[PDB]
């Protein structure tokens, strides 16, 4: 429940038109403003007032409003339109505080698949001098944003000491993730190698490091 309500999720195919709606009793008499937000960045104003658009926002963003509702329309959606969208206005009660909608996560369907790029770093000599050891497996540029990570000491699967991040959206709308294998310096030096195996859409990429 909110003063400004909007659907939490909506999808659109590449090149198609989607419309995001905002409803609230404050919208009669206050024109809603719309904001686009990509993960990790500040919100960006895209539409305000009566289909008024700030300088620099592409023409495919338009806005409308009727009654107690406001609508943001994205005509011919591109990949760079995938983001969260918030509506916003002032309340009609009291001294008119600013109220935000809950947010709408827009998914742009039909984007091309991307295979993960994997880089595996061995423990640094400085960390080993500190009686610690960390294997760093960096995964980037994969789409869709679902990956499973498997670690192996020599050839045997390893689950202890593994901490993996959730995938996060990059600037190019692909996803990134990292996985850390914590070891004692004795474990690292007493094995022939360790491997990070990254599986994505049924295909697997493996990187291997060894003490030397």
């Amino acid at each position: 429940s909110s003063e400004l309500t909007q659907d939490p999720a909506v999808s659109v195919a590449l090149g198609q038109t989607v419309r995001i709606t905002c409803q609230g009793d404050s919208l009669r008499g206050y024109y809603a403003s719309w904001y686009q937000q990509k993960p990790g960045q500040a919100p960006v104003l895209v539409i305000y007032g009566k289909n008024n658009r700030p300088s620099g926002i592409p023409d495919r963003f338009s806005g409308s409003s009727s009654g107690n509702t406001a609508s943001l329309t994205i005509t011919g959606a591109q990949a760079e339109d995938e983001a969260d969208y918030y509506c916003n206005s002032r309340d009609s009660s009291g001294n008119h505080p600013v109220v935000f909608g809950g947010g709408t996560k827009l998914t742009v369907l039909g984007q091309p698949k991307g295979a993960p790029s994997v880089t595996l770093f061995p423990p640094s000599s400085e960390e080993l001098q500190a009686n610690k050891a960390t294997l760093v497996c960096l995964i980037s540029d994969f789409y869709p944003g679902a990956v499973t990570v498997a670690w192996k000491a020599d050839s045997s699967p390893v689950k202890a000491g593994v901490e993996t991040t959730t995938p996060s959206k990059q600037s190019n709308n692909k996803y990134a993730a990292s996985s850390y294998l914590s070891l004692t310096p004795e474990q690292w030096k007493s094995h022939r190698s360790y491997s990070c195996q990254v599986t994505h859409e049924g295909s697997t990429v493996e990187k291997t490091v060894a003490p030397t």
Binding site: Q37, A42, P43, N52, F121, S124, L138, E163, Y180
Partner: protein, 220 residues
């Protein structure tokens, strides 16, 4: 041409007072504009905090009214936010923004500053070089980086060569370990032919713990 920049402590103890400042350039702070504060908890929606205009008229979110103060320093052309009696529900990224005096909107935003409310103590990270080698070198391209290990709280900023190196840089989101400490890595992709000539240095800054380190990354 107005630009905004937040600045804050990063960590605030429970029931303490959060204090932030926003530096304003390209516009007088005494203008008819409504200088505003907005926050956003991790993974949650935006919440409006308050606004001030002419350095006199304030308007606050009713759910926060008794705890919020927004002030203006005309000599420094800044405005500030103070939130008292904080709890974990106040852990969020805080933005300063600008609204005009006629429709409402916030067209100019700051970069945002992270504040976490927690009773735990700060923790400075160890910065380890991730050295390039033949195993991290595919073609005429080499990968090197820095491991920023065991810090609290978020965030950590990582640049390369004092910001003069931006192409090929990828700073990954941090992992939250079972110990409650964060660790992240930043990797840069460079021509493997430049390894013997170009010096590569990662600039790590963790303000909550006063940890500012420039770590040189060399091939062993």
């Amino acid at each position: 041409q107005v630009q905004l920049q937040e600045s804050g402590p990063g960590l605030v103890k429970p029931s303490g007072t959060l204090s932030l400042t926003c530096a304003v350039s390209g516009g007088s702070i005494s203008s008819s504009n409504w200088w505003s504060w907005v926050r956003q908890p991790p993974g949650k929606g935006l919440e409006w905090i308050g606004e001030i205009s002419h350095g006199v008229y304030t308007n606050y979110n009713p759910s926060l009214k008794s705890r919020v103060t927004i002030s203006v320093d005309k000599s420094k052309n800044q405005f500030s936010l103070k939130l008292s009696s904080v709890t974990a529900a106040d852990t969020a990224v805080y933005y300063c923004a600008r609204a005009p005096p006629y429709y409402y909107y916030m067209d100019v935003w700051g970069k945002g500053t992270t504040v976490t409310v927690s009773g735990a103590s700060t923790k400075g990270p160890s910065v380890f070089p991730l050295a390039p080698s033949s195993k991290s070198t595919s073609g005429g391209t080499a990968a090197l980086g820095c491991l920023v290990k065991d810090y609290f709280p978020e965030p950590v900023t990582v640049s390369w060569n004092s910001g003069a190196l931006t192409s090929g840089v990828h700073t990954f989101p941090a992992v939250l370990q079972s110990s409650g400490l964060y660790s992240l890595s930043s990797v840069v992709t460079v021509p493997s032919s430049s390894l013997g000539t170009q010096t590569y240095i990662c600039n790590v800054n963790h303000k909550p713990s006063n940890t500012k380190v420039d770590k040189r990354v060399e091939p062993k």
